[PDB]
Design a protein around this ligand. Structure first.
Ligand SMILES: [Cl-]
Length: 282
């Protein structure tokens, strides 16, 4: 599929933070929200999702929290505001690195706050607790063991990790559950492969890889229909801001984002995909 002439093309990965602000909530969370109350706004549900993850970590004053894949910094903002802990956030996105650094610098704190442009395989600092929301689905399966081994090694004896990631099912499970994958679903999976690399883990894969690194899985919490609602709102916001999206980028880029959001929404609504928070203990 390689073309003989290099072509500087327009990718969904080239859009600015301003483009994401057309459809994310004000905290710029780009992961599944948690509608703990049915009438929550998107921002309230994103706050609730971060608070849900952080509460599972049993943070105590003075600890250091690592956020692997800190995104646009909403999780660490909640951690700094609500806990008396030092924090380290890592991301490999330069835009997210600068955005999160500037966002968190505005927050009063009596603890240390660091944001780094760094991947987990470069990270060796000892930390007390780890949160990772929406990063694992960008990892290649051949790196899973190394990821859990590194996570285990940087935690203390009492360490805890909250891993939040998207999940798929085996065909046997889908047949059992009465989920019928159609040609249009197949074409959407092909679109994902062409625009987003790799397959998605099943719940059982996370159990297997975590336990092989000597973690215990104490809890899995599944948020399937919360993601369907999250994606619905994102797509509605982007459509409301369609003219501005097209002016910043193009109708092609607008269409690709809308196709992505609404196709993913469908996969959660129909039951092809899920999303889980895994509490891992050492
Ligand atoms: Cl843009």
């Amino acid at each position: 599929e390689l073309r003989p002439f290099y072509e500087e093309s327009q990718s969904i990965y080239d859009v600015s933070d301003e483009f994401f602000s057309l459809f994310l909530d004000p905290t710029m969370a780009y992961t599944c929200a948690y509608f703990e109350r049915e009438d929550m706004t998107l921002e309230e549900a994103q706050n609730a999702k971060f608070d849900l993850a952080l509460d599972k970590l049993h943070l105590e004053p003075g600890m250091t929290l690592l956020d692997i894949g800190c995104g646009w910094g909403g999780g660490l903002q909640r951690a700094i505001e609500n806990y008396d802990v030092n924090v380290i956030g890592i991301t490999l996105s330069r835009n997210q690195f600068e955005y999160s650094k500037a966002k968190l610098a505005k927050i009063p704190t009596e603890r240390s706050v660091q944001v780094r442009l760094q991947g987990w395989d470069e990270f060796t600092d000892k930390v007390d607790r780890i949160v990772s929301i929406g990063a694992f689905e960008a990892f290649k399966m051949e790196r899973y063991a190394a990821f859990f081994e590194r996570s285990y090694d940087i935690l203390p004896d009492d360490g805890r990790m909250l891993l939040h990631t998207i999940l798929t099912y085996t065909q046997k499970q889908m047949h059992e559950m009465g989920v019928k994958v159609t040609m249009s679903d197949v074409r959407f999976m092909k679109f994902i492969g062409e625009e987003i690399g790799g397959q998605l883990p099943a719940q059982e894969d996370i159990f297997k890889f975590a336990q092989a690194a000597d973690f215990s899985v104490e809890k899995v919490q599944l948020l399937q229909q919360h993601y369907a609602r999250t994606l619905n709102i994102w797509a509605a916001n982007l459509e409301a801001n369609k003219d501005r999206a097209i002016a910043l980028q193009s109708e092609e880029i607008y269409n690709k984002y809308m196709h992505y959001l609404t196709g993913c929404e469908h996969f959660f609504r129909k039951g092809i995909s899920n999303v889980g928070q895994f509490t891992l203990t050492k």
